Amino acid sequence: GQNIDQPTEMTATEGAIVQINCTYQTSGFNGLFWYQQHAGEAPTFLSYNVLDGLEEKGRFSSFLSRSKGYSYLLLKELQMKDSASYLCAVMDSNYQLIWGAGTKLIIKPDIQNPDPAVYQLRDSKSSDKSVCLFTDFDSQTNVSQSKDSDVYITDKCVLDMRSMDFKSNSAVAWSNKSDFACANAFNNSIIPEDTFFPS
Amino acid sequence: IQRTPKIQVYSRHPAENGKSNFLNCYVSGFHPSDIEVDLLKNGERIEKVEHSDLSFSKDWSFYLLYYTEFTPTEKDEYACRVNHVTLSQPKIVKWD
Amino acid sequence: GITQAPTSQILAAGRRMTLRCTQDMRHNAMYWYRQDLGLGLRLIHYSNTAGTTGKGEVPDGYSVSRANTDDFPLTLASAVPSQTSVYFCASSGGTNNEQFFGPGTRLTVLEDLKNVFPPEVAVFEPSEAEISHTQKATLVCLATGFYPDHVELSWWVNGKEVHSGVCTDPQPLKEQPALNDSRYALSSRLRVSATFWQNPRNHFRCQVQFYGLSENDEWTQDRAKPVTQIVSAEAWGR
Amino acid sequence: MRTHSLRYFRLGVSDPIHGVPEFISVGYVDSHPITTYDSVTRQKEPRAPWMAENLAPDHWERYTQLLRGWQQMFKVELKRLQRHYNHSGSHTYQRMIGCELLEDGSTTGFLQYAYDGQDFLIFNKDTLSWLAVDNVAHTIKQAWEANQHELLYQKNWLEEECIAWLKRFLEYGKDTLQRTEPPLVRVNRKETFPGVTALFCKAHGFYPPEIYMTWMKNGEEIVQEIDYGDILPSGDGTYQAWASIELLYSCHVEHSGVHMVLQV
Ligand SMILES: *[C@@H](C)/C=N/c1c(NC[C@H](O)[C@H](O)[C@H](O)CO)[nH]c(=O)[nH]c1=O
C-alpha cells in the first residue's frame, strides 16, 4: 500500500461518545486492525475487520466500508482509562501490515465543583525554592507553555481521589528567576476570572 | 488410491513422411507426482528433448508434455517410455 | 508471552548492541519495529518462519537472525544516534493474523556519555491556603536535571506505594528547549485530605527510578558515575 | 472478455524420493503457468515472460518470504494428517485456491484440500464453512471453523483480492490470453472393419483450448455413439482435438463465437 490516515489527536468529555476515523489508500486489502497503546506501553489488539459492517465488543465498536476504504473505532461511555493512542493498521495485497501514525485520545473529566486557585508551595528542606500550583479549574481552561526560558510550566493533569469519588485538574509552575511569583506564574494562560489568589 | 498415467503420443501437425514436425508425448492423470519419461527413436533415447514442468489438474492428478523436433520416416519407429509407481516395469508407448 | 532484553539501554555511538526477543506462543512469524514520535511503527526486519528473514521498511544499520522459532535477535553492529528509539518485538501465528507486542526497549545512542545525569528529586509541602480553602492537601514532586528522559516516578505513603490521588506528567519537559541535549524535568501531584496531612506519624515519599549507565560502562570524570538508581525525597505530616 | 481463471496449487510430499521436493507451489492464469516455488530453489520465480516484465523484484522478494512460511505450515499439516489416519510412509497433501471471472461479469471462488489425491476439505464461502469427507477431515474442520476471522479473511480474499489479481495478470498477459487462433478442421472417411465406415472430425491449431465439436445426422443430434478425443497441447501454444462416429452426416465445430459445419 501507500497511506493510512487518522487524526493526530482527539479530545472528548467523560461519559460521552468518540469516533476515531481511519482512511486507507492501499494496493489491495486483507484486513484492518485497531490497537490501543497506553503511554509508555505495548500496543494491544482491539479489533479486526475484513468484510463490511460494524462489530461491537463492549463499549468499543469497529466499522468497515471496503468500497469507501474507511473505518472507524467508536468508544461509548468514555472513561478516563480510555486516554491512550489508537492505532489503525491495514494489511495490503502483499500481507504487509501498514500502520497509521496513531490518534492520541484525551478525555476531559466532568468537574462537578470547580474552585480555581493558584497556591504557593514550600520545600521542606531549607532551599527557599518554590512551586506555584494552579488547581481545581474546569476542563474548559487550557494551560499555555512558559514565556521565560528559566520558568517551567507543566501540562494539565487529572488526579482521582478514588476514596472520595473526586477528580481534579492541575498544572505546576516553577523557577529560580525570583523575580517570579505565583500571581505572575500563569499570566501566559487564559485563566478563570474568579481564580483564587491567596495572600 | 494410485492413478496410472495416460500416455498420448502424437505429432504437432498432421504428419507427412519427409516433412519436419514435432513429436509430442502427453502424460496425464497420474498420482503420486514422481514419473520418468523418455522419447525414443528406434529404441534409443533421444538427447534433444524439451519438457514442461510438472502441472496440476483440478482432480488432484498431474500432467506433463515432452516433445522433440523430428522428420517422420516410413522406416522410423518412435515411442514414449514412461515409469511411475503404478508400473512394475516401464511402459513403452509407440506412435500410431 | 513475549519478553525483550534489555528494556532500557544507553549506548555510546559506534558500539555493537543486540536486542533479544523470546516468545513462548510457538508463533511462526516474528517482527521488529521502531516507534518514534509523529510516525507510526516502522518495520525494520521480519521473519515468517525459523530459517528465514526479510527486510522491512527501515532495515539499515540493523541485522537479524532466526535459527529457532522462539528467538529473533536484533543486532545494531555500530550504533548511531539516529537509532535512539523505542523498539518493539511482535509475533503472529500466521501471516494474515494479529500481532502480539513485547514490552518494548528504550534505547538511547549518544555521541558521548558525558551528558547523562540522574535526577534531583524534591517534595513540596501543601499550601496552608489550600488546606483552609478546600480541606485537601496537594504534595508536589519535581524530578529535575536528568538526561536521558528515562524515568519512573512513584509515591509511597507509610512505606506502601499509592495510586489514588496521584497524577504524574505523561512526558518530561525540556529545561533548555533550544539545545539538542537538553536535560529534563518531571512533576507529580499527590492529593490527600487535610486530616491525613495533619497526622505527623504519616510519612510521604516520592520515588524516582532512573535508567542510566551499567557496571560495564567506563567512567572518566570527577562527578559520580550516573548509574541506574533510585532518587527519593520525603515529607512528614504537619 | 471470455471466461478467465486464476489458481494456485500447493503440493506437499512426506519423505520424498531422491529427486522430488518436499513442497511445490505453482500458479495458473487459465491453462498458463505464471509462478513457481519449491523447497529446493526456495524462490518464487516467474513461469511466463509477461509476469517477469510486469512484477518488480519487491513482489518476488515478499512472496518468497510468504512461500517459505507456507512451506513450513504444509509440512506440519501433513504430519498431523498422517498421525490422524495412523499412516506411515510417503503421503501427499494438496491445496487449490482460485478464481473465475465469467463472460457475464459474475465471479466464482474456490478453496479445496486433498490427502493422497482425494478430496479432503472443501470451503463454502457462502455459508463460511468447510465440508469434511470423513472423520479426520471432521476433526480439522472443527479447528478451522473456530477461527471466524480466518473464514472472513478467506471470503474476502476469494471474492475481492483474487479477482483483482486476475484482472491485473489478464492485462499483463493480454497478447497471449486474449488472442484467438481459429481451428483448422478436416473430415477423414474410412472403410474400417469390412462393413463399417468410420468418420473422423479433426481440429488443430486452435487457441483458446475451449472447443465444442459434435456430429449431426440431418440437422438433428447423433443418437449413436460419438468418440471424443482429448483437447491436447500441440507444444506451440495451440491445441488439437477430434470427434468420431460409425455409419447425410455433418461435423459441427464451435470456437470463440464462430460456428463451422463440415458436410460429408
Ligand atoms: C505470488 C502472488 C504467489 N502466490 C501464491 C499464492 N497466493 C494466493 C494467496 O494469497 C494465498 O494462497 C493465501 O494462502 C490465500 O489466503 N498461493 C499459493 O498457494 N502459492 C503461491 O505461489
Read off the CATH number of the domain in which D228 is found: 2.60.40.10
Domains in chain B, please, with CATH? Answer: 1-96 (2.60.40.10)
**Integer Cα distance of D35 and D37 in angstroms:** 7
Q: Decide if D76 touches C, using CB distance below 8 A.
A: no
Which residue, B37, B65, B54, is CA-closest to D25? B54
Which residue, D92, D172, D81, is CA-closest to D133? D81
Q: Which chain D residues touch B58 with a CB distance below 8 Å?
A: 96
Residues D224 and D148 reside in one and the same domain = no
DSSP type of residue D41: T
Q: Could you tell me the distance, in angstroms and rounded to a whole number, from the CA of residue D35 to the centre of ligand 1?
A: 10
Residue D17 near residue D176, CB atoms below 8 Å: no
The amino acid that residue B49 corresponds to is V
Resolution of the determined structure in angstroms stands at 2.5
Residues A3 and A84 reside in one and the same domain = yes
Q: Quick one: residue A182, left, alpha or beta (phi over 0 = left, psi -120 to 50 = alpha)?
A: alpha
Q: Which residues contact A128 (CB under 8 A, 6 or more apart)?
A: none
Q: Quick one: residue A121, left, alpha or beta (phi over 0 = left, psi -120 to 50 = alpha)?
A: beta
Which residue, C170, B66, C157, D187, is CA-closest to A38? C170
Residue C182: Cβ-neighbour burial (10 angstroms; 0-12, 13-18, 19+) = middle
Q: Where in chain C do CATH 2.60.40.10 domains reside?
A: 1-111, 112-238
Set of cell numbers at residue A32: 484492518
Q: Which chain D residues touch A31 with a CB distance below 8 Å?
A: 153, 156
Please identify, by atom number, the ligand 1 atom nearest to the C-alpha of residue D161: 10
Residues D159 and D258 reside in one and the same domain = no
Chains that touch A (3 or more CB pairs under 8 A): C, D
Please identify, by atom number, the ligand 1 atom nearest to the C-alpha of residue D36: 22
Q: Which of A109, A129, A155 is the last residue of a domain?
A: A109
Q: Do chains D and C touch (3 or more CB pairs under 8 A)?
A: yes
**Integer Cα distance of D74 and D87 in angstroms:** 17
Q: Chain B to chain D, count of Cβ pairs less than 8 Å apart?
A: 67
Residues A192 and A101 reside in one and the same domain = no
**Integer Cα distance of A82 and A37 in angstroms:** 10
CATH number at residue D50: 3.30.500.10
**Could A152 and C185 be called an inter-chain contact, meaning their C-beta atoms sit closer than 8 Å?**
yes
Residue C235 near residue A124, CB atoms below 8 Å: yes
Say if domain C112-238 classifies as CATH 2.60.40.10: yes
Q: How far apart are the first and last CA of chain B?
A: 31
**Could C52 and D153 be called an inter-chain contact, meaning their C-beta atoms sit closer than 8 Å?**
no
Q: How many CB atoms lie within 10 A of CB C167?
A: 21
Q: List the single residue in D59, D62, D161 with the smallest CB-CB distance to A30.
A: D161
The fold of the C1-111 domain, in CATH, is: Immunoglobulin-like (2.60.40)
Q: Which residues contact C37 (CB under 8 A, 6 or more apart)?
A: none
Residues D84 and D193 reside in one and the same domain = no
> Which structural domain, as residue segments, surrounds residue D107?
1-179
Residue B41 near residue B48, CB atoms below 8 Å: no
SS3 of A142, please? coil
> Which structural domain, as residue segments, surrounds residue A71?
1-109
Q: Cα torsion for C168, C173, C175, C181, to the nearest 10°?
A: 120
Q: Which chain D residues touch A30 with a CB distance below 8 Å?
A: 153, 156-157, 161
Residues A127 and A193 reside in one and the same domain = yes
Please identify, by atom number, the ligand 1 atom nearest to the C-alpha of residue D37: 22
3-state DSSP of C99-146: CEECCCEEEEEECCHHHCECCEEEEEECCHHHHHHHCEEEEEEEEEEE
Q: Which of A58, A85, A109 is the last residue of a domain?
A: A109
Closest CA–CA distance from residue B23 to any residue of chain D (Å): 9
Q: Whose CA is nearest to atom 17 of ligand 1?
A: D8
Cβ of D113 below 6 Å from ligand 1: no
Residues D184 and D126 reside in one and the same domain = no
Residue A198: Cβ-neighbour burial (10 angstroms; 0-12, 13-18, 19+) = middle
**Integer Cα distance of D71 and D63 in angstroms:** 12
**Could A159 and C100 be called an inter-chain contact, meaning their C-beta atoms sit closer than 8 Å?**
no
Which residue, D147, D136, A162, D21, is CA-closest to B34? D21
Q: Cα torsion for D21, D22, D28, D34, to the nearest 10°?
A: -50
Give the determination technique: X-ray
**Integer Cα distance of D167 and D49 in angstroms:** 17
Closest CA–CA distance from residue C161 to any residue of chain D (Å): 42
Instruction: Report helix angle D135-145 to D57-85, nearest 10.
Output: 130
Q: Which residues contact A168 (CB under 8 A, 6 or more apart)?
A: A111, A135, A136, A158, A159, A161, C191
DSSP type of residue D158: I
Please identify, by atom number, the ligand 1 atom nearest to the C-alpha of residue D97: 12
Residues A17 and A58 reside in one and the same domain = yes
Residues A124 and A28 reside in one and the same domain = no
Which residue, D209, D221, D212, is CA-closest to D243? D212
C165 φ/ψ angles, rounded to the nearest 5 degrees: 75, 10
Q: Which chain C residues touch A198 with a CB distance below 8 Å?
A: 127, 129, 133
Residues D34 and D156 reside in one and the same domain = yes
Which residue, C4, C142, C152, C171, is CA-closest to C73? C4
Q: How many CB atoms lie within 10 A of CB D209?
A: 15
Which residue, D189, D249, D246, D243, is CA-closest to D217? D249
CATH number at residue A158: 2.60.40.10
Interface test with A, best of C3, C37, C58, C98 (most A CBs within 10 A): C98
Interface test with A, best of C34, C86, C189, C203 (most A CBs within 10 A): C189
Q: How far apart are the first and last CA of chain A?
A: 62
Residue C75 near residue C64, CB atoms below 8 Å: yes
Q: Which residues contact B88 (CB under 8 A, 6 or more apart)?
A: none
Closest CA–CA distance from residue B37 to any residue of chain D (Å): 14
Count of structural domains within chain A: 2
Set of cell numbers at residue D73: 505450515
